[PDB]
Design a protein around this ligand. Sequence first.
Ligand SMILES: [Mg+2]
Ligand SMILES: [Mg+2]
Ligand SMILES: [Mg+2]
Ligand SMILES: [Mg+2]
Ligand SMILES: [Mg+2]
Ligand SMILES: [Mg+2]
Ligand SMILES: [Mg+2]
Ligand SMILES: [Mg+2]
Ligand SMILES: [Mg+2]
Ligand SMILES: [Mg+2]
Ligand SMILES: [Mg+2]
Ligand SMILES: [Mg+2]
Ligand SMILES: [Mg+2]
Ligand SMILES: [Mg+2]
Ligand SMILES: [Mg+2]
Ligand SMILES: [Mg+2]
Ligand SMILES: [Zn+2]
Lengths: 115, 152, 304, 217, 108
Amino acid sequence: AIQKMTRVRVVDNSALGNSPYHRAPRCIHVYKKNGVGKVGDQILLAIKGQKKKALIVGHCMPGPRMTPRFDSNNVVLIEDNGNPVGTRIKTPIPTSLRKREGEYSKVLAIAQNFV
Amino acid sequence: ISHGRVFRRMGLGPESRIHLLRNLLTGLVRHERIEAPWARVDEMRGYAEKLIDYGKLGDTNERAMRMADFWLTEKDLIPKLFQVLAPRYKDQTGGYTRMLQIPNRSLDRAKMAVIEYKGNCLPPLPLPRRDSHLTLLNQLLQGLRQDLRQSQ
Amino acid sequence: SGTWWDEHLSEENVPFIKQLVSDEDKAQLASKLCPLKDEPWPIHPWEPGSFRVGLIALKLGMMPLWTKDGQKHVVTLLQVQDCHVLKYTSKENCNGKMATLSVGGKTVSRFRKATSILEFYRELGLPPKQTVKIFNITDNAAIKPGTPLYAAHFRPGQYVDVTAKTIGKGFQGVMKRWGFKGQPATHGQTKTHRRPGAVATGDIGRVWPGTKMPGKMGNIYRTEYGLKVWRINTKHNIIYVNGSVPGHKNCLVKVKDSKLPAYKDLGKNLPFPTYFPDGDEEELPEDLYDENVCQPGAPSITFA
Amino acid sequence: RFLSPEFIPRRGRTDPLKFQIERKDMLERRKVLHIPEFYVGSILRVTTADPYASGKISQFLGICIQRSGRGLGATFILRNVIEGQGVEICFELYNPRVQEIQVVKLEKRLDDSLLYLRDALPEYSTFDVNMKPVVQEPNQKVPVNELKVKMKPKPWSKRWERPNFNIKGIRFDLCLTEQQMKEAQKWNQPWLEFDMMREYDTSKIEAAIWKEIEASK
Amino acid sequence: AAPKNRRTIEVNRCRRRNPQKLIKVKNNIDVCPECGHLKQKHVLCAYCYEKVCKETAEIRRQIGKQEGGPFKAPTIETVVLYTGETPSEQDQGKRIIERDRKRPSWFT
RNA sequence: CUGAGUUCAGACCGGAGUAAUCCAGGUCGGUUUCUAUCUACUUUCAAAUUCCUCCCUGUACGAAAGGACAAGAGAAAUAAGGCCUACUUCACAAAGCGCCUUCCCCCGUAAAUGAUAUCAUCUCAACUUAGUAUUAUACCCACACCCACCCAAGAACAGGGUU
RNA sequence: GCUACCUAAGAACAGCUAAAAGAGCACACCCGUCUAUGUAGCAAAAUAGUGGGAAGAUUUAUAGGUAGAGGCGACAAACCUA
Ligand SMILES: [Mg+2]
Ligand SMILES: [Mg+2]
Ligand SMILES: [Mg+2]
Ligand SMILES: [Mg+2]
Ligand SMILES: [Mg+2]
Ligand SMILES: [Mg+2]
Ligand SMILES: [Mg+2]
Ligand SMILES: [Mg+2]
Ligand SMILES: [Mg+2]
Ligand SMILES: [Mg+2]
Ligand SMILES: [Mg+2]
Ligand SMILES: [Mg+2]
Ligand SMILES: [Mg+2]
Ligand SMILES: [Mg+2]
Ligand SMILES: [Mg+2]
Ligand SMILES: [Mg+2]
Ligand SMILES: [Zn+2]
């Protein structure tokens, strides 16, 4: 569960995510009617003094049984149009995204590992 | 809500509850018959049977010894448990204690109960007894029982 | 003076009486196993608009169930225990819209029942039952009293409504009873944490009827609508119903067909009056499954 | 003789028949899919079909860290560090999508729960995905790994130093001071051990389970 | 929050003479067959129990006398013998308690 | 229940005043207690809304750009009512962060036939359809002893079980 | 005999760091920052936690002095038997 003002780990090849900064990227907003964000939920970050859209790919909070649980809250940066900012995802990505409603094909394509 | 809560809240808290029950149990092992408030007696009863079971488990057993050492504050009672109480009940698998309600306490009008270990040396309690077989109702039913067994 | 059954009985008479009454109950139950062999009430074919009798079941508990698509559904187990039709009332006699069947479930002690109830059951020739519930039926769905009811009355794929008394939470405050937000912990808030705020408005010098206030919650009848029957166990008389039914485990629930307009006329394939095992046409297996249900003993499912 | 944890019911007011029904169902599933003997210390590889893909086969290897739940719904969490990222998956034993369960290494740790591995160094939670299984001889007691794990700095997911957790598999000496030890000991509850009405004797129960299991076979 | 008005004796009588407030008659009372004093059913007869307790106290006084000081609980069974009684085969190897009075009828 | 202001007992700044002191100016600090007598009320219940995605369909429409409505399907969020198989807080149980269920319409107008006013005219003309009208159905419903004991019932009382 | 100040002759201040002090941490002791409790209370000002000081312009026992048009005051119109 990712809410407003949740510190977040960017799992991406993108320069914006990986570049050193004094503060960790923080969730500005969750694009869901309830504030709570899960896997496949688009969020808005404060990263490097700019507002940027991101997609959640795993989190610490437990979910359904067979679904994986990650030790860190993991996001992938996306532009307003919907394409990913970064080229590659090294961190393993759950396969539950495929069936979920939304634009997940781009992210799965650039992903290398699935858990 | 207290659905499926099996232990009473007594004393000054959980530890105090254990200590209160321990004292009642020590009293019971020594005296073989104890007057106390009904609820406290009812709470202690379970522990009384469990203690006899650990007594049966053996003198040599270290686990049973540790339990006996805890529950019996007076140490002289620990031999008694292993060598007197446990051999007494070797035949039966349970029902070591007998609990009966007693007229309310004078001072505070508390519901009271007597608890004893069965087969004690002490004078027998005025236990409630079911009606004699020779009563009118019992005679009629004995007639019925006879008729049924004759039918078969 | 107050009297109970075994007050005046001897030491040896108590076990004898217990045995005698238990055996009579067993005999009476066993007597009613063949309703069709006894003179039945006429059996009519199912018609649109017709409503059949339901059952009284005991809530055993819950277990998971899986489907071929891979989705997990939790189910509640309802065991049918000594469920008999007790009474029939005509529409004119009931002074109501429909004919009624009183149906009882879960046999109980004769010693703990009132004389009136005991007399009624004596006339029936059945041991007394814990709960009696009334089912509104059409005339063509009438069943002779004394007729046993079984879990196979319901069939997988059918939707049912379940009614029971909810778990009683006793006297509860507004937060647990009505989900009131309460007041903050710190920043003052002297004695206001869980209290109801403003109960009413200033202008009205009173409190409206039916305002949400602290009181007794639970221990009232509620109905769960549109629960799917996933599985029947004919041997133990178990109904597997989708999701959760009201009440604690080992309580008695009233199970009837769904009243929801979607499932209005889906009673075509169901046994109309009831299921009669003594009929013995196509003897049902131990377990009846829905098509989607992953049966135990089936091979591991692959999503192809 | 090893009995699977789920077979033994938690105490309550549940009708015994409910357990009988659930047990028979469990036993049919066991006939189809062999569920091997494993403990919390044990390393397992689970083969599963995923509904999200078109019947593709997924293997996941990791150390079991928790066995919980009873009956058909029984689960086990197994944990592994995959390319820097620590992942736990909670597998249902009687889920029909579970193709195969393999015990790569069979062992017990000092503690019944290994949730403290979350706060331990990553090395203890990292296992090779392609490790070959080690076979135990038919007649031998299951080995116990007396491994004490080193820990990360003090802020932890749970206060493991507290006696309620009763953790015997952490080098507490390294990461904690004696002051912190005595602070933790204030929560001791010494009486709790000797409370003999809280004890649940699963002797007769297990015997009845075993009768039903041998009947099923 | 203070009363706005004095409550009358009429209203007060209605409150305090309500059946709810009244003492309920007890139907548990029966004659104890042993002594003839009244006992509540479900409860041990007060008189009979007092008698038993008096005797128990006397025996306990004797037990304490024979033991001598604290922490002297015997590791053998105990038996109580009155005047004109000798230990039996069963009573042999048991602690003997001597009483100066005769056997009670109820004591067996 | 609680900020601030009126608003002050202490203090300073700017201005006024011989001063004491003042400001209709600014800033810091600063105590309202209540055991409910009466009225009223304390599970009316059994009817849920909405968004998004897909189909239609990339259709009708339009020169293109763009881009529907009905009907249907799937996913959610909230609300109301429940529940504990799992997960999580925990452990004979209570909970949510978990799971389950959720049913009718609204009336403004759009039209036929047809007089006053032999055409026409939807009619505070008689009238005819959309129009649905009073929704309805669901739930509840038998009553020992009121020793005692137990309880998933409960403040007490009451209720369920004791074969 | 409270309190403000003074006079006479007294008493108290663990432990640790310190070139060594109206120094620091910190007991006892003195005070009363903030919160909660209490509000006919344990109490006509308290309790619990948290705080400020704690070799000194320190704290404190005893006896004496200053008296209302007045005393006394590190001025708060403070204190001078609620
Ligand atoms: Mg209780
Ligand atoms: Mg108390
Ligand atoms: Mg709150
Ligand atoms: Mg408070
Ligand atoms: Mg206050
Ligand atoms: Mg946490
Ligand atoms: Mg302040
Ligand atoms: Mg009753
Ligand atoms: Mg001097
Ligand atoms: Mg010093
Ligand atoms: Mg200093
Ligand atoms: Mg200092
Ligand atoms: Mg001064
Ligand atoms: Mg001044
Ligand atoms: Mg002033
Ligand atoms: Mg004065
Ligand atoms: Zn008597």
